[PDB]
Design a protein around this ligand. Structure first.
Ligand SMILES: Cc1cc2nc3c(=O)[nH]c(=O)nc-3n(C[C@H](O)[C@H](O)[C@H](O)COP(=O)(O)O)c2cc1C
Ligand SMILES: Cc1cc2nc3c(=O)[nH]c(=O)nc-3n(C[C@H](O)[C@H](O)[C@H](O)COP(=O)(O)O)c2cc1C
Lengths: 368, 368
């Protein structure tokens, strides 16, 4: 009973904020609000966005720069721009082509697709979209150790070159939109088919987050690392002590995130947590940053603040919310062009130069 | 004319500070004061030392650590401990075995030897002491481009795997001890003789530095890197902007140093400059730190603050004075054992763990 959009077209992206309102006049109310919403009254989602005004870019003059190069390398992948696709469940809420549609955009653009444990697409559907493109697999710890062995084997057979252990979701955030809407996922998770015992449709949202491992410990990071023989990112980190713990427990990367503000409420905007984590990590492993990236300036500010790449989420999905629809390859291309402008105006010839930018401290915050 | 010590023996190093007074009993007065002294009234040499009290280590308990590993890697060299030998002129002022004695200690210990352009030993004599051990060559640039190509070609043919461009000595520091003692070198410098016309023997350091290039520019960093095809460190950096510049001009490493306080007077202690430089470098290239390292705690604090390795200077030369290669070796062994203790008490199993340490800010400074 779910009428997702199915039209395929390029979009002229002026900015990613307008993509949210664009789509809701076939684009189902409950699924839109599942994608767009966040915990509580969404103050921490607003914080993710307003945090970018805390540290401001300087234009830099006569820097001897032209035709900036956005390419970078992470864990042996050369990628077209320093952004990857974040792992997101249930892309079928946004478009009938679901994760296969996103994978084709990501692969055709030339970056890394992160595949959610809660994908609505089969791997063979996602694989058809990827057409050999690089992919990382995101897992939740299962209570059942055999389920963890089986899903790590699945990801490795499926050509994953890293595992993303999302650790910030041991229970659901207080997602008021989903509660008020009495939102139920309308389709299955053909990858985690080994846990929910009864039915997937008969479980709303509280019973599925509950279904996964709550008692994750550093030993789980050690055991994923040992079993997989792949680099493991720990995703959801906001406190520097968790970054040190994760690296000591064998993580190969730190993924700074608050899950798009969909988890803990009345927490900091994700960008505000990044410098303290980067200083603690002190180059030991690569850092991925997400939660609120909407502009080229945000990609630059994350790199200047210690991230190696950012991950994109909601703007890429925007095949849905509020008005008439937009989000895909056009969105990836927008971010690459947007970043190229920012590189030219900050004196940055290449992605390494972005990592050396000094930012202006704005103590007044958003209202200035 | 100059009766340097010649005895070869191991020494029991309680601390490296006591080596200074002990070396003053065996090294002729002029040469001793050339090694020990610094600019002006030595306030910035004292600052180098007192800066270590600005950021204090925490003991950490129940950290599940035993038998810490001090090994690390820099620019594809596995080394026994995260310290290398700093390039120091004229080792024959300390011991008759001169740079060959230092080279033997460094290669026997298992780290990298840095060769001063103002060595009193030939590449051949140093090569014999190294017995295949890794070496980096420190250039004091000639004004003549062809002499630079020749020096660089000789160093690379001798087996250099990096070039160190020392840029902080375009003129001498105000070294009052050497002025008062009317210090002149008592022997020749075979590597740079080509541009001294005569011999370094009987020359002041003013006149030797005066022969090297004053008008060093970013183009010089580019041209050394292009000609050598070796990674180039820029040495003497204390301001983060020079780090950004050096990297944009093709440096493969930043070497944070104030030359052991022998150059600009009434400048900060070197360790106080490190964090700002590390934050600006932001992982782009490796950082070597020097100027005042005397204890294992100093090695740990440098790594915690963004350095990949430190370079050792005066203490090693004082060891050479007191025991030739075995005395110099005794000092390197002291630093390795000293660091191992500090790793155990800080909860550090390996060198990467040291990079993740938080330090206590001491705003009272030395007198507390
Ligand atoms: C609709 C939606 C579903 C998500 N599902 C997952 C998930 O399955 N796995 C996961 O690790 N994170 C998940 N996240 C979090 C994202 O990986 C990412 O952290 C977030 O989208 C970044 O915030 P932004 O999209 O507002 O920039 C989801 C986020 C959204 C918006
Ligand atoms: C006696 C002496 C001679 C030095 N000669 C050189 C030199 O030839 N080349 C160079 O790059 N630095 C030279 N330096 C600086 C060292 O590389 C290094 O920065 C310094 O020894 C670090 O300070 P510390 O020994 O007090 O810890 C010299 C230092 C000393 C003590």
């Amino acid at each position: 009973e779910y009428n997702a959009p199915s039209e395929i077209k390029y979009i002229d992206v002026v900015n990613t904020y307008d993509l949210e309102e664009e789509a809701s006049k076939v684009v189902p109310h409950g699924g839109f609000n599942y994608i767009a919403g966040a915990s509580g009254d969404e103050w921490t989602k607003r914080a993710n966005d307003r945090a970018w005004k805390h540290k401001l870019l300087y234009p830099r003059l006569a820097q001897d720069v032209e035709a900036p190069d956005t390419s970078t390398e992470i864990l042996g992948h050369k990628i077209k721009a320093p952004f990857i696709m974040a792992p997101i469940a249930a892309h079928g809420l946004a478009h009938t082509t679901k994760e296969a549609g996103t994978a084709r955009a990501v692969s055709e653009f030339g970056t890394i697709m992160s595949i959610s444990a809660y994908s609505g697409a089969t791997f063979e559907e996602i694989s058809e979209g990827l057409n050999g493109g690089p992919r990382w697999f995101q897992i939740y710890m299962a209570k059942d150790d055999q389920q963890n062995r089986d899903i790590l084997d699945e990801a490795k057979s499926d050509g994953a070159t890293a595992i993303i252990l999302t650790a910030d979701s041991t229970v659901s955030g207080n997602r008021d939109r989903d509660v008020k809407n009495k939102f139920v996922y309308p389709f299955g998770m053909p990858i985690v088919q080994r846990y929910l015992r009864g039915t997937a449709e008969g479980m709303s949202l509280n019973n599925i987050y509950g279904a996964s491992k709550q008692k994750i410990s550093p030993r789980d990071i050690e055991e994923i690392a040992a079993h997989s023989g792949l680099p493991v990112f720990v995703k959801g980190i906001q406190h520097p002590e968790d970054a040190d713990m994760a690296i000591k427990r064998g993580a190969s990367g730190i993924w700074v995130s608050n899950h798009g503000a969909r988890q803990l409420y009345e927490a900091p905007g994700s960008f505000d947590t990044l410098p303290a984590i980067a200083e603690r990590v002190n180059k030991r492993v690569p850092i991925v940053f997400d939660s609120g990236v909407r502009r080229g300036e945000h990609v630059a500010k994350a790199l200047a603040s210690g991230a190696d790449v950012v991950a994109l989420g909601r703007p890429v999905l925007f095949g849905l919310a509020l008005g008439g629809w937009q989000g895909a390859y056009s969105v990836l291309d927008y971010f690459q062009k947007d970043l190229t402008r920012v590189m030219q105006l900050t004196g940055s010839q290449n992605v390494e130069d972005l990592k050396g930018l000094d930012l202006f401290d704005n103590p007044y915050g958003y209202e200035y």
